């Protein structure tokens, strides 16, 4: 049981970005718990989104999550720099193990 | 503010055992949902156990289970989690997250807040 | 200025019952009518009051007591009935005036093995009065000084994990509850609308 997350995205600053984030009937669609964090290589990932449209302290607007049945979907605005990072999106499920990880995106910009 | 510091890990043999310690600075770890996030070189993350706040739920990573087991020393306000019995496929980087709605009246969704520095272990000849 | 009632009843994590909470709300203007969007509501009912006309009268001051028990024990909440739910876990009066909400809630509080994360006093020297909470561990005895620390025929653990698990009877599922309770002595006026 494990979220699957896409591979790689590329843009140029002014550009903007969409990640898919699919899972079964019990993790993402049905519980729509699902969070999304950020990773640069050499820390420990920090926390970018929660419950989806609560966005946290700190961030930018430019992150825009949405949950659509069992898909759940980012989307970037404004192309920068500092996206160059990896992303994972998390959920809490109900059977045993409470969350799991999305297999994870790295955004690279041009 | 917050702070997750780690000790512990580092180099082992295949067969024998470690112990990692998650110190809690900046907030009272007492009473707060605990839960280790493990992440082998180069992959992404994975779950490995549970502490709640009562101290009678514990919840285990299924391929974890049988082995390393975990405690809180709430008299040394520290959490525990003790390796036993390894193998080569554990070698990875350990981090210890708190739960952010630990409060009573949250009525919002989980989210893995404060994160831990993290540390990693090795496990070969 | 309105009352937070979609605060505690969007609660995201409740109390056991033997440690249940309680929380005062008053100074506010407060509506029944917005309760019955939650839930299948398998129970609603009051006592000294009837629901319809409920939004109209001002009270002195309500309480609100949240707690999560089994689901074939629900009955055992009602004023001034025996059974092991109100003996030495919590109880309320023989006179109670207010009313109790309930939703079976097996879809966040149950999972696979059992949710060992409620539990009850199963053994208690002497039933309990009205409204008072205990949290006193100690060993049940054993016609000796009780095991200090161990358990033997007897000398068991006072508290017992209920372990819900998602495939029970509908009686076994647990259910999350909340409790109404205001007096009416027409003291200053402090809530209604």
Sequence with gaps: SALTQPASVSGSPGQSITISCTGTSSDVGGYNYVSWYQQHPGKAPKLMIYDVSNRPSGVSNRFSGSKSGNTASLTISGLQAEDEADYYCSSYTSSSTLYVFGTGTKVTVL | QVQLVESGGGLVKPGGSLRLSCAASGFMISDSYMNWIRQPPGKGLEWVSYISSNGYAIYYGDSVKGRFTISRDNAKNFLYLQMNSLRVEDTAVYYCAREQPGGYYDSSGYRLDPWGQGILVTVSS | ????????????????????????????????????????????????????????????????????????????????????????????????????????????????????????????????????????????????????????????????????????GVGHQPYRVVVLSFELLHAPATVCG
């Design chain 3, 1 to 168: 200025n309105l009352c937070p009632f979609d605060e505690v009843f969007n609660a995201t994590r409740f109390a056991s019952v033997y440690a249940w909470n309680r929380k005062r709300i008053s100074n506010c203007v407060a509506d029944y009518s917005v309760l019955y969007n939650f839930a299948p509501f398998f129970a609603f009912k009051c006592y000294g009051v009837s629901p319809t006309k409920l939004n109209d009268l001002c009270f002195t001051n309500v309480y609100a007591d949240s707690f999560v028990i089994r689901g074939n024990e629900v009955s055992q909440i009602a004023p001034g009935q025996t059974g092991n739910i109100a003996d030495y876990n919590y109880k309320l009066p023989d006179d109670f005036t207010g009313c109790v909400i309930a939703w079976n809630s097996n879809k966040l509080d149950s999972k696979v093995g059992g949710n060992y994360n409620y539990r009850y006093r199963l053994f208690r020297k002497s039933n309990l009065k009205p409204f008072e909470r205990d949290i006193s561990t100690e060993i049940y005895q054993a016609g000796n000084k009780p095991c200090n620390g161990v358990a033997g025929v007897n000398c068991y653990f006072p508290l017992q994990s209920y372990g819900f698990r998602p495939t029970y």
